[PDB]
Structures are given as C-alpha cells and as structure tokens.
Amino acid sequence: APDTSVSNKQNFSTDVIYQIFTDRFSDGNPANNPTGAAFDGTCTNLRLYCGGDWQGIINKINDGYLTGMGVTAIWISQPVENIYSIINYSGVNNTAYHGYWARDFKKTNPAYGTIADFQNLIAAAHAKNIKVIIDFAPNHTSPASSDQPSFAENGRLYDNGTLLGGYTNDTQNLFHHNGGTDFSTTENGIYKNLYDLADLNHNNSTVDVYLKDAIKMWLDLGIDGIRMAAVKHMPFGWQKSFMAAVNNYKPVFTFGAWFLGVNEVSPENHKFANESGMSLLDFRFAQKVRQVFRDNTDNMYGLKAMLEGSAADYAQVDDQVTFIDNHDMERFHASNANRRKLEQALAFTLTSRGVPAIYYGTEQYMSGGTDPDNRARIPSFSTSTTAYQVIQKLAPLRKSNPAIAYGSTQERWINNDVLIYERKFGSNVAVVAVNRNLNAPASISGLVTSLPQGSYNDVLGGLLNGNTLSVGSGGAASNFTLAAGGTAVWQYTAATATPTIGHVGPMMAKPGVTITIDGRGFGSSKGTVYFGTTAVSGADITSWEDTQIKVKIPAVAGGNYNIKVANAAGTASNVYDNFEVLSGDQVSVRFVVNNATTALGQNVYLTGSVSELGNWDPAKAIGPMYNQVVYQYPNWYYDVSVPAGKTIEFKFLKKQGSTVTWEGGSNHTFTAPSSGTATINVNWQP
Ligand SMILES: OC[C@H]1O[C@H](O[C@H]2[C@H](O)[C@@H](O)[C@@H](O[C@H]3[C@H](O)[C@@H](O)[C@@H](O[C@H]4[C@H](O)[C@@H](O)[C@@H](O[C@H]5[C@H](O)[C@@H](O)[C@@H](O[C@H]6[C@H](O)[C@@H](O)[C@H](O)O[C@@H]6CO)O[C@@H]5CO)O[C@@H]4CO)O[C@@H]3CO)O[C@@H]2CO)[C@H](O)[C@@H](O)[C@@H]1O
Ligand SMILES: OC[C@H]1O[C@H](O[C@H]2[C@H](O)[C@@H](O)[C@@H](O[C@H]3[C@H](O)[C@@H](O)[C@@H](O[C@H]4[C@H](O)[C@@H](O)[C@@H](O)O[C@@H]4CO)O[C@@H]3CO)O[C@@H]2CO)[C@H](O)[C@@H](O)[C@@H]1O
Ligand SMILES: OC[C@H]1O[C@H](O[C@H]2[C@H](O)[C@@H](O)[C@@H](O[C@H]3[C@H](O)[C@@H](O)[C@@H](O)O[C@@H]3CO)O[C@@H]2CO)[C@H](O)[C@@H](O)[C@@H]1O
Ligand SMILES: OC[C@H]1O[C@H](O[C@H]2[C@H](O)[C@@H](O)[C@@H](O[C@H]3[C@H](O)[C@@H](O)[C@@H](O)O[C@@H]3CO)O[C@@H]2CO)[C@H](O)[C@@H](O)[C@@H]1O
Ligand SMILES: [Ca+2]
Ligand SMILES: [Ca+2]
Ligand SMILES: [Ca+2]
C-alpha cells in the first residue's frame, strides 16, 4: 500500500480532513432523532439536536459531496453515548447534540446511530477512500453538581450499561472534587472541572483501565484517527500512557485540541506535541492565518514568522492539524466580509505543511459568532461555490504532490501583503503565491524557485485570479503581475531517485510494534532501516515499496532514535529524528515528593533510571511538578508514564532555569504496576 492509501492509519499529511459536526451535517435517519424539547428539526435552536446522524454522513459520502470536494478524511463528533438530559442553563435548554457529554464510552450515541450504523459508516468511508477520525473526550463525562445529584445526570459514568459511579457520593474517587478551573494555570485547568464538566480521575485504576479499554473498542471498530478533546485539561503524563496503549495496540493518527489564543506561543504546547505521543491542532497557525487574512491584525511578515517558528518548535510540524476556524470559534467568514479572504485562507492552508482540517460548511461561506452560532446546519450541499472548487482543486494536491504533504516551507518572495512560498520534497516542488491585498496588484520580480525551467499554469485555473508562471534557468521566474487578492499555485512533480523520508508514525512505541515510514525513493526492493546505529532488515521489515515501508521496532533500549533508511543499493536517506522507543508497556504513575521547599522560580522535577524518566538526565527530567490542586507545597506531585512492572530508580531535582540541584541520599526505588495506576509517595532527601 502506498503512503496515500486510505489504509494509512498513521499518516494524514496527504489527506484533507473535513470536520463534521454530526448533528448539524445531515439527518440520514430521522427514526433516531430525539424527541420533544431536546430536538428541533428546523435547527433554529442550536442548543438542541437537529437530527444530524451517521447515516447522513454515509449518504454524503456516497452522493459524492465530500469526494467531489477532494476530501480524504473526516473528523466526526464523539461517537460515545452522551447524556440524555436537557440541561437548563438559566432558562436556556441545552442538549448533548455536540456529543461532548459522554456517559458511556463503550456505547454509542443513539442519536448518531448504532454500533452497526457506525460500522456501516466506516465501511462507506473506506469504500470512498475516506479516513475516519473520531473525537474523544476522556477528560470528563457531563455537567454535574456534587451537592445537586438532581442536576443533569450527576456526571454518572457507565461501562457498557453498568453504572460505575457519579459525581455525588464519589467514595470511589472516579472524579476530581477540586471545583472548577479558571484557566489560571495548567495544573489548575487539569485537576479542576473543565467548566462544570465532571473531571475524571485518571489516577484511578478503574477509570484508567476503562478508558484505555474503551479506546480499544473504537480502535477495533476501524477508526483511522483520534482527535483528543481538552488535551490541556488532562495530566500530560497520563495521556502519554494513553498514547502508549493505543500505539502498542493499534496505532492510529492522533492529535489533541490545545487552544492557543491570539499571539500565544506556548513552549509547553510545543513540548506536549513533541513528547505526548500525539500531535496537536495548529491553533498558532490558525490564529496567525486569521490575523493575516480575516482580521488584518498582522501582515505577511507575521505569517512567515509563524511558519518558520512552528517548523522549528514542532518536532513533527507536518503532524499538526491546521485550520482557519472550528466549532470553538467564530466562523472565518463574516457575512459582510469579502469571500476572497476565506478562499485565500483556504488555498494557503490546503497547500501548507500539516494536516488541513476544514470545518463543515466553510465551503458554503457559513458565517457565525461563538458557539453555538458557529454550529448552524449546513445551508446546502452545493458544489457551485468557489471555496468548494478551491478545495476541490487543491486537496488532491496533498496526494499527487509529496512536496505539499511532506515538503519543506521556504519563503521565496515577500512583502506586507504578498507572500510567495515554496514546498520542496525530493524531485517535487510547489510554489504558492498569495496577494492578500484585495485592492492592489503586486509586481513580482526577482522571484527564484526550485522549479525546473518551464511554463507553469495555475493549478487554480485562475480561479483565485491566478496567473501563469514562467520559469527560466536557475529557477528564475520571469517578472509578472500578481492580481489583487490573487492566488496562484504552480507545481512540479517527478520521480525521486534518492530515498527520502517524509513521514513516520507512530512516533512513540515499544519494540515489536510496527511503525510506518512514508516518503519517496524507497525503491521496490526491500532495503534497510536504521533506528540509530541499529540496522533492521529482512523479516522485521513487513512491507517495503517506493512510498511506504512497514517495519517492526527493534528490541533496543528505551529512548529517542533517528530513523533513516537505505535502498537495496545502500543509498541512505535523510533523517527523521525524534522517534521514541518506549521501555515497554506503559502505566500512569503518580509521583509525590514531600517537604521540597523552594524559592520563586525554583521548580521540582523528577529523574530516573528509565528513558521515561530521562535516564538521570536533568535536561530530560520530568516536570515542573505541581503543588496546588491535588497536593500543596512544599508537597509536589505529577503523573508520569512509566514502563509497567519495571523496577525503577528515581530522584527528585530542584530546577532554576537549567541549573540543577540534585536530591540527597540514595536513589528512590519502586516497581511500576503491571497494569493500572499507582502512587509513589517519598520524602525529599536533603
Ligand atoms: O460550585 C459550582 C460549580 O463550580 C464549577 O462549575 C462552574 C464553572 O467552574 C464555571 O466556569 C461556570 O461554568 C459556566 C461557564 O462559565 C459558561 O461559559 C457556560 O459554558 C458554556 C460554554 O461557554 C459553551 O461554549 C458551551 O460549552 C460546551 C461546548 O458547547 C461543547 O462543545 C463542549 O466543549 C468542548 C469543545 O467544543 C471541544 O473542542 C473540546 O474538545 O472539548 C470541550 C469540552 O468538552 O463542552 C462545553 C462544556 O459543556 O456550553 C456551555 C454551557 O454549559 O456554562 C458553564 C456552566 O454554568 O459555572 C459552573 C457552575 O457554577 C464546578 O466545576 C462545578 O462542579 C460546580 O457545580
Ligand atoms: O503562575 C504560576 C506560577 O507557576 C510557577 O511558579 C512556581 C515557582 O517557580 C516555584 O518556586 C514554586 O513557588 C513556591 C516558592 O518556591 C515558595 O518559596 C513559596 O513562595 C512563597 C514565598 O516564600 C513568599 O515570599 C511569598 O512569595 O509567598 C509565596 C507563596 O507562599 O511557595 C511557592 C508555591 O506557592 O511553585 C510555583 C508553582 O506553584 C512559575 O514559575 C511562575 O512564573 C508562575 O507565577
Ligand atoms: O544576493 C542574493 C540574495 O538572494 C536571496 O534573496 C531573496 C529574498 O530572500 C527573497 O525575499 C526575494 O526577495 C524579494 C523580496 O521578498 C521583495 O520584497 C522584493 O524586494 O523583491 C525581492 C526580489 O527581487 O528574492 C530574493 C532572491 O531574488 C537571499 O535571501 C539574500 O540574502 C541574497 O542577498
Ligand atoms: O549520571 C548517572 C547517575 O545519576 C544520578 O546521580 C546523581 C546523584 O544522585 C546526585 O547526588 C549527584 O551526585 C553528586 C554528589 O551529590 C556529590 O557528593 C559528588 O559525589 O558528586 C556527584 C556528582 O556526580 O549527581 C549525580 C549525577 O550527576 C543517579 O543517582 C545515579 O544512580 C546515576 O548513576
Ligand atoms: Ca437523525
Ligand atoms: Ca481533567
Ligand atoms: Ca523532526
């Protein structure tokens, strides 16, 4: 199977995701529609079920709506069973139409469909080479009150019909009872209730195993991706252990939703995306895009900055899910706005690095403010829109031109409003020119690219006022005029002689697990695969062709390895660093250190004898540890993914910048549980 195959559950870079808000997409089966006050067939009240279901999606898949657009993957709402109550928030009735109020992760939302329906959906999708990504909010269940078991459904958690427990009288401790968060701090937003949502307690073995077990089911149902909701409100350590469970079972492309406000650039975010075991939704990208094309709060320069920075801050930038809007923010298009702004933001996104995600209805020019105003039912399924044609013309590129999927990003021409960038990958190139200035044209001279000499027509067919590019010798493009609001796309594709790695997934797993290595120039005859200095060939290399290679992770020590391959001839390829070989099966372990006083700026960290602990390396130490919610200073705590069953030696550190002060005495010792969670409580040694 080629990298572009719908079977590629590890790489979406060649795909164009279509974010589908089920309830608001299409009602293929009204027999499952909810009744009474929880439903509004007219979709006037955006806080109630409108009827959108899985069958609706199947129909959309079969009727060529999505396919005709060039969509190769969908991102659907959480499939799990949600609460049935109609939460009345100050005289305002609310329903779980959004599917974020789960009540049983092992069951499905009868409103969307049945297991069978879901199965038919996946079947339909794959039949149309369409990948299926499902939302997953294992951070909570539903709204609930501790003193009012009457409100909502008390956040009651079910395990395939069997009541596990509720928020009230939670003597089991399945949830956190630290009130709500004010998003003041990361730890704050983690161990506190996301709004009024019953915050699950992943430190609880039951909850931990149940959740992991639940994902297994959906994984067995054939899903091709996982969009993790509120990845910022869940302990980072546990999520890794969760990614480990997935990857060590049935690895599938996963990305979390980590909100990033305007002009917000988080290192924690970069780190999470770099070591969580999952990617992230490129909010930084989206916000900048909006600032540049929608709000005009920044120019091409800010865009370029975002591009370069992100390409350096993200270990695997091509794994970041890009977008221009979503269900959590005002639709990119404003009723009064100039359509070209959206079309441009679209063209840009569809040709940039990462995995482009398109919010349903965007191609219909839907406008709307904050939720639920941004979740209106798709006005129509018209293929006549310009946005539709844009996507339609650009999307396929992600499959025909590896430069777009895995290529690099280099600015070739730039100014306040004009931006001309190039994507390169092997013998493939893509030059994109965007003139956001809707009132002024731009004289493009001195443009240099990697495009071989030749005449290049606009792949957009002048759709966005594009033009033909004339490339002479040296990649020098003859002077040309870039129409106002003009957007062109020139490309070059050719066979790649030398082995080039464009993607690798998953990026974190234990030996014996099969990773997927995509790119071009691998050759038909099997070659060699390197996990650092360790060479792997023959049998452990399940499959090998030109664009895709399947191989089992060698039994090497835990840690980061630099992947690389060599054709049957010995010709070595580029390097795809940052691969993580786990020490084995993982389990979320909570470490607690007491009496660890410190001074402002000084934060406690954790080090240990395993790669999951940094192998005694302070730079790779775990932390900074928390000390506010669950435990209070001088008491520090933190949930960490450690190799299960293993006997690990660990020590605590006191960090100040990169200056480290080691713990005294001897190493602490403990043996990781074989499964479930555990709490290692030790005192700081002077
Ligand atoms: O002791 C009292 C009480 O305290 C705590 O609870 C209070 C809470 O701390 C406090 O903030 C407040 O909460 C209210 C909030 O301030 C209001 O904004 C409102 O919330 C509405 C949201 O603004 C609105 O966007 C929407 O939110 C839901 C989304 O529609 C839905 O899609 C989903 O959001 C998901 C994102 O879309 C998705 O991308 C992402 O992946 O995951 C998100 C989360 O799943 O979920 C959103 C939340 O349901 O509707 C909201 C309407 O409810 O109402 C809040 C409730 O009043 O008051 C709280 C009560 O005082 C404690 O936590 C609590 O235990 C305690 O009783
Ligand atoms: O925004 C949240 C903050 O998060 C991070 O802060 C860390 C600090 O870097 C740590 O030093 C630690 O803070 C301890 C502090 O070490 C300790 O001395 C004590 O501070 C007292 C202080 O002695 C007293 O003079 C006065 O300042 O009151 C303080 C409160 O008692 O307690 C602190 C813990 O509350 O932990 C925090 C995280 O909680 C981050 O580095 C900061 O930028 C950020 O503000
Ligand atoms: O001496 C060679 C020269 O080449 C490289 O410059 C390129 C710029 O980096 C690139 O931005 C582009 O420049 C255009 C500007 O963006 C635009 O504002 C306007 O001024 O036209 C310019 C083209 O004439 O192209 C040039 C290459 O042509 C390299 O970065 C330089 O360091 C180097 O001096
Ligand atoms: O590097 C591997 C090694 O790391 C860990 O050892 C650290 C000690 O725990 C820590 O106390 C500190 O040791 C210094 C002593 O305190 C000091 O008295 C004198 O002996 O110098 C030491 C400096 O090396 O730092 C080391 C790491 O630098 C871990 O505990 C070991 O098990 C592990 O082998
Ligand atoms: Ca229905
Ligand atoms: Ca949480
Ligand atoms: Ca990298």
UniProtKB/Swiss-Prot annotation:
Q: Which residues bind Ca(2+) 1?
A: 27, 29, 32-33, 51, 53
**Sorted UniProt keywords:** Calcium, Disulfide bond, Glycosyltransferase, Metal-binding, Secreted, Signal, Transferase
Q: Name its GO BP terms in alphabetical order.
A: carbohydrate metabolic process
Pfam families from the UniProt entry:
Alpha-amylase (PF00128), Alpha-amylase_C (PF02806), CBM_20 (PF00686), TIG (PF01833)
State the residue spans of region: D: 496-582
Chain spans, region C: 407-495
Active site positions: 229 (nucleophile), 257 (proton donor)
Catalysed reactions, as listed in the record: Cyclizes part of a (1->4)-alpha-D-glucan chain by formation of a (1->4)-alpha-D-glucosidic bond
* Principal EC category: transferase
Q: Which PANTHER family match?
A: ALPHA-AMYLASE 1, ALPHA-AMYLASE FAMILY MEMBER
Instruction: From the Swiss-Prot or TrEMBL record, give the protein name.
Output: Cyclomaltodextrin glucanotransferase
UniProt organism field: Niallia circulans
Which lineage do the record's taxonomy fields give for this organism?
A: Bacteria, Bacillati, Bacillota, Bacilli, Bacillales
